[PDB]
């Protein structure tokens, strides 16, 4: 009905973004573990596997966040990387979910 149509139209999925770490040949594995623990609340075990994924797969997803939070994570991780003089690049892509 009219009320039910109003419900339907208000169920557009949230714009969500994957926060991604991209591999490079200069950033220490230990530093990537540190990043994952500091900014994403991963335990050492989970942080280690994701870091391995970065190294062997080329990139890995750190988690999925609202646009606003995702941009905040990217800013922080990149800042942390540069101040430690590493090229590690944290970026975003739309999840579609």
């Amino acid at each position: 009905q009219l009320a039910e149509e109003k419900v339907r139209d208000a169920l557009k999925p949230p714009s969500m973004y994957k926060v991604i770490l991209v591999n490079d040949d200069y950033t220490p594995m230990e530093f990537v573990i540190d990043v994952l623990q500091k900014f994403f609340s991963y335990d050492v075990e989970r942080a280690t596997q994701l870091m391995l994924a970065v190294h062997y797969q080329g990139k890995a997803i750190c988690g999925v966040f609202t646009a606003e939070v995702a941009e905040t994570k990217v800013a922080m991780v990149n800042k942390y990387a540069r101040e430690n003089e590493h090229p590690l690049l944290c970026t975003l892509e739309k999840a579609g979910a």
């Binding site: 591999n23 490079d24 040949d25 200069y26 950033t27 220490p28 594995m29 230990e30 990537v32 870091m51 970065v54 190294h55």
Partner: peptide, 11 residues
Amino acid sequence: LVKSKATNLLY
């Protein structure tokens, strides 16, 4: 990424 050096001292 860069792997850390292994630790060894007379084993």
